[PDB]
Amino acid sequence: RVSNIHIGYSFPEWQIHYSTGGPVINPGSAFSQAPWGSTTEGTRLTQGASEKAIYDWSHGDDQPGARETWWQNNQHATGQTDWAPKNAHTSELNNNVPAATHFWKNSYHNTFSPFTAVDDHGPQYPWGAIWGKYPDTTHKPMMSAHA
Amino acid sequence: GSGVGHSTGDYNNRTEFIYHGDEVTIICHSTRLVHINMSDREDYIIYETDRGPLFPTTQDLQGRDTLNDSYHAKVETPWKLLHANSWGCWFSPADFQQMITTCRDIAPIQMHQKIENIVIKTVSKTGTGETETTNYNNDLTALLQIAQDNSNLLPWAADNFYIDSVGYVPWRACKLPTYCYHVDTWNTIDINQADTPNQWREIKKGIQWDNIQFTPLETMINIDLLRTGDAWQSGNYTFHTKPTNLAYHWQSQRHTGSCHPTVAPLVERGQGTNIQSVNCWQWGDRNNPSSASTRVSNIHIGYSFPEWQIHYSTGGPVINPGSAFSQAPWGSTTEGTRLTQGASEKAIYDWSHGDDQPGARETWWQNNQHATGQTDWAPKNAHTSELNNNVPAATHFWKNSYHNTFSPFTAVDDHGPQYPWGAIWGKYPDTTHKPMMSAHAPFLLHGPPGQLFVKLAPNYTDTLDNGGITHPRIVTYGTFWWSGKLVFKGKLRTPRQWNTYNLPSLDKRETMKNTVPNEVGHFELPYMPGRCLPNYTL
Amino acid sequence: DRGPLFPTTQDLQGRDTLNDSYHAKVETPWKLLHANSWGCWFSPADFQQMITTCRDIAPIQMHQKIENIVIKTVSKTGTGETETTNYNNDLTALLQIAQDNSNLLPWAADNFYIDSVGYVPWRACKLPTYCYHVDTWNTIDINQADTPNQWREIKKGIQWDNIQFTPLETMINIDLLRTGDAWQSGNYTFHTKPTNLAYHWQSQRHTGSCHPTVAPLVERGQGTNIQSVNCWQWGDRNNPSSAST
Amino acid sequence: SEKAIYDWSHGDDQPGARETWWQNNQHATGQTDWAPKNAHTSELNNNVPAATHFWKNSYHNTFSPFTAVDDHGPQYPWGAIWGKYPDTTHKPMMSAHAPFLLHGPPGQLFVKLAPNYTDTLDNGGITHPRIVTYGTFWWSGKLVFKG
Amino acid sequence: GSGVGHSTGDYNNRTEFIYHGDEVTIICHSTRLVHINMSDREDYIIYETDRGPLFPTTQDLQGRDTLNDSYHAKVETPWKLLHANSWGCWFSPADFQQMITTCRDIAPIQMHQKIENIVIKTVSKTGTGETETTNYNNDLTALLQIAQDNSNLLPWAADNFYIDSVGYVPWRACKLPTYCYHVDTWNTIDINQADTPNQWREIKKGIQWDNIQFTPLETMINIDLLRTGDAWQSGNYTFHTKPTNLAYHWQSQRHTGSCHPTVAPLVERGQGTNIQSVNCWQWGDRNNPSSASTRVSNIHIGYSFPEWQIHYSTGGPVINPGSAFSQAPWGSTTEGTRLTQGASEKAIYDWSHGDDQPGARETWWQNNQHATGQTDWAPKNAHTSELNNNVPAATHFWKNSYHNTFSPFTAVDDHGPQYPWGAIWGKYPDTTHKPMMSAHAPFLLHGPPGQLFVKLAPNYTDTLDNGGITHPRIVTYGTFWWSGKLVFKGKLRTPRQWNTYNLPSLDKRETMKNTVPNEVGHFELPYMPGRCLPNYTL
């Protein structure tokens, strides 16, 4: 049914950009893999632009001389979850059900469009950065991937 | 005076066009009689739904059939929702033609609305058997209760996406849809599986109860109780938005800018020749040939998108729309082969909304046929590795791909207003990134016009026991008169060309006699696009 | 016509169809004069002066003039071999000038064909003729269901029903000038943003805090990345914690 | 990358021929992202991906809300200084050639010689000869920049 | 400054639409380049003319062929006449569409005009044989002489009935017709004779010399001599007239008033039945049946006239027009059988006026096809002696008569404006009884806009002898730029109906591509009627 906007967008993930400085990750949008069966214990699905913090005794860690890891799947954001292997597209949208041909299951594409409403990570305690810096470029980013 | 026997309002449904230099002010009046009856229950309820019709129970279509899922979970309220959001509510067919002929762009300015001439009465069946007699007699002391939600505390259900609104025809009575809104539920269908391909399976299905949000209207907003002699005023509402363009754009990326230098033809019906060697900016490392196909440009008009993109979300599968464009250049026609590819859309509507006969639903499929400059259809595009004087090889050329070419350079354009059935306005989501443009309603609002809820207060019998088991109530219905005024402003249109235009008419699929009433009074409102006249983009 | 090097055959199976210049225009008797280009306003040393000494720049205001108008006619009396031509003034003759301020006419001065006033100040210049596109469908199908590795044209031609034809005479006021009078543009003020005159060399791995390392002890020695550090990593990954992720 | 084709009237050495200058944009190395060289993998964790779950050769559009990017900038001699926005609901975010996009661009200036007819113009349309005429005028302009 | 090398004017040809509430102000600018050359002679002359082509020299068609007489007698003057009277002069096709779409009625308000940028030059042929060379070189001292006739002392020749006016296309050069006017002559042809029937004979033919009136312009009005550096102003002219209605009327005498009482149909596609016994005013002594055919009415719409009425006058045979109406209800069609009966008219026009190709003349026959309410065609009417409950006998009924039913009761309606070629205004005759309405031009004026005369002063050689035999003069021609501004005012039109209109377009006989220029630049202006939209009369 028609709608004015779309919530979320697929992105090739994890996108490895080989740049002039070296390979990097190009992030996708933040979302929870919980609707798809992800859990901290058991099978972990990293797909949601999840991130891990590595920290030591000086920053919020229990014992000296070791580093502790906290992996945050962003588990409360379930409305934004769009994961490209699960999406499909068909050629014609009508009263007929598509054929085996004219249906494409497995593609990875970037659906970010003028219609997409999306949402960022937000503040992460303790370890998240509060602020960040814009680059000076003709096109500034629309939103931040961490801070 | 005021009381039982004095009328609280009058009937005004008519439009006004105020012309001053380079400015048009349209004042739309709409008055409708609304037939309301007692709620199915006095309680809020929350329930899951079935999948829907034509959802697969088997693997035989191997998942391609799962687009049919309507499954969801809602909280249904005793309240009814009354909104005017649609074009056919405010305009008659001749008023909308007047607007789209004489105006360049338009925006809504301010709005207010009223409810008055409230009548409530009860049904008493004394028939006691065959040849049964019913009596309809007033309850002078009885309450219609009205709640306007100004601060938008309640979830937004009035988007006109189910075309449930006040009627289009002024002299007919109307009925309101029941208000209800979604609750959090996971619906995740896996059509692509590692172990077992060509299968579909549901991973997580059900209501998520832990964080569920349940909001009654009683706790959120003040409710006004009205009797037969008093009336209700909305107050003024002011839109904050941008005008929408009433002209369609025919120019593609090769219809804009300076055209390639040519040698004019000497005779009649002769064609010019492109000069081979010219000064040009070319893309890539290419001088030969320097052609209009490859030359630099500041912008690009249109973008490809995977279409139709089926997004399997936490709530279920959805369509992720592409840009609106006409498939006519590729041979699409309403009759014959239909190409749905342009982000086309169909309206389903009934006798209450612009339909000819009662008891049936009519369908209007709009291919957006005037927008031919924006048309970009991914199977037809290609890409090559090197752009130079050489023609690419079989390798280094990719024909069939589906990609999203939306970039910083793309200039694109929306659907625009659709008469009768299109929504006038819509609501932004609150997210860090707001959408750049709307896929249906021409105007997205941060605060949209407040939602207006209407309900009949219950009339109990004498047997209410406080225990909960027996709370009968006497059958009751009511009617009230809804008035509203919406003001638009726009820019006056003047001829930019020598030759005559094609002024907005009736789509070839419609004829004039089906627009006017019948021997029995049946007629349907015609379709008109909000953009019926061409103009230059750049 | 299509243009040079457009395929007439299927031998290159559609890959050759990028060469299409086909279009449809309305050509006007008017000539177009614009200064839009960098080489018009700056000399090579002036542009070097600017890009050396400035961070960013934007245009502010502009005006222009036309004057010292001379019009004359050609008279060939030669009547055969050893032909003589005479160039003599018409004192009463008109140059007509139209400035389009409200942008009612289609926009043809983009400098994409590099047709502009000359770059060299001491040389004479000639203007391109003004013309603009009309609505036409050109749709080539290089990807077909029935017959692959083919190309076919679906819709080709001018769309006459809604066509727009705008003369300058009806849209804008035209000024007629004789040899003694001159023409002024009036002032024009740009509204825009500055553009940055510095290029950026930093990639996504040249920005931000660099990975912690152990500095080299000797000359031409290279530092070593510390294996275990505090970091924010993408995904569920501590090992290795690298500048890549 | 883009190439300019220009003649003696515009910055060219010899008359009667056209010269070509291909500009690879060679100073902008930080922005370089070339799709055949990028890759994406399914899971990002301490494990190295398998042969499956790694996709080398794809071509996708990674433009996202997070991307900071940068345009061509001014090109001497031949680059356009300004350009025109299209009127559409979504205006482009940045220009692919001219450094400055304008809503109203500088007005277009049109020039024509009025016709000088002979005495034989017949009003019928068949014969309207006109005497061969040419002209010269001097164009002056002043453009002000600030930076 | 001013002199040889300074231009005296600028080119403005464009229209402006000023909208204020219920009022429209249209300001039309028109500027044209006029090519003028030396007069055929510097003297006035007076001469008779031949009959014309296809006039009978024999009795074989027994007089029916004598309608072809063009015979007359004129006084031809060296002056040329320049008038803007026509619709196609002031409006472009899109401007006229804008007007007739958005306005109810309109009238011209004020007008002024100019002449400037005067160039005069001479032709010198030195070729002296084959391969001849001509030189075109300025005479800086030479005179264009201009005479505006404000008081209307000269006979009125600018009626645009020969469609000789300033050109319709702004970018093309124009040429003026020579001014000349009739002198008194008797032409009387007798097609009905007592002695010898089925013959034709001329009684009195020739110029009547005794009372003849000969008026030069030199004696009547002041003449302005202009050189290349000076320019000419008209002064302001103000029209005094009434607006003309831009809506056509479809209602006949049986489409007006209260309709006969009927019983509505119960089903779909059923038709109602007229109630047999009703209260009515009937004509005559008649109650049975009381039918919509016979019932009283205050007025009558339309009148029959003998048509085509050929009036044999003292000047020759003429057509006496009937009222304008459509023959479409009777089965007339442009293709197929054409019925000319409605006071229809044809325009003959050339490349200079709205025609596609040079060297040929194109014809447009306008049946007035939107006016169907006024249609009264005498062969179809009948009359009977008694009007009562009895049906008339074979006697007392007259079928085939041709009579003029114009009466005090008749309401009738004129042609209205015809684009491009119709005259805007006309001139009243001075007679004791002025006509009630016009047969062509929408506006009849007492003082019409003054006639403007233009002439090149003669350039003699040195051989002028004062004896009259030798007065050679050097071949000279000129060009000047004519500017004018005509202001119109009218009433804004608003929708009176629910359903959409048919907005003014292009006649089925025209297509859009013939309106726009060609590969070689050939195009023709489309026909539009000034009344393209319906409205209720009474």
Residue numbers in the entry:
A (entry chain P): 326 to 472
B (entry chain D), E (entry chain M): 32 to 569
C (entry chain N): 81 to 325
D (entry chain N): 375 to 521
What's in the article?
The capsid also protects the genome enroute to the nucleus for uncoating and replication. This study determines the capsid structures of TuV and CuV using cryo-electron microscopy and image reconstruction (cryo-EM) at ~2.9 Å resolution and compares them to the recently determined structure of BuV and other protoparvoviruses toward functional annotation. The VP ORF encodes two overlapping structural proteins, VP1 and VP2, sixty copies of which assemble the T = 1 icosahedral capsid in an approximate 1:10 ratio, respectively. The individual VPs contain an eight-stranded (βB to βI) anti-parallel β-barrel motif, with the βBIDG sheet forming the interior surface of the capsid. The virus capsid plays a central role in the infection by the protoparvoviruses as it mediates the attachment of the virus to specific receptors on target cells.
In 2016, CuV was found in human fecal samples and cutaneous T-cell lymphomas (CTCL). In the CuV capsid, the depression at the 2-fold (blue to cyan colors, corresponding to a distance of <110 Å from the center of the capsid) is broad, continuous, and has a slight diagonal tilt relative to the icosahedral 2-fold axes. While CuV’s VR1 is extended compared to MVMp due to a five amino acid insertion, VR3 is one amino acid shorter and adopts a different conformation. The absence of this loop separates the 3-fold protrusions in the CuV capsid while the loop merges the 3-fold protrusions in MVMp as well as protoparvoviruses CPV, FPV, PPV, H1-PV, and LuIII, which all share this loop. In contrast to TuV, the two highest signals showed glycans with α2-6-linked SIA in a 6’SLN (N-acetylneuraminic acid-α2-6-galactose-β1-4-N-acetyl- glucosamine) context. In contrast, CuV possesses a lysine in the same position (K377), which is similar to the CPV variant (R377K) unable to bind SIA. Thus, while TuV might bind SIA in a similar way to MVM or CPV, CuV’s SIA binding is likely different due to sequence and structural variability in the capsid’s surface loops.
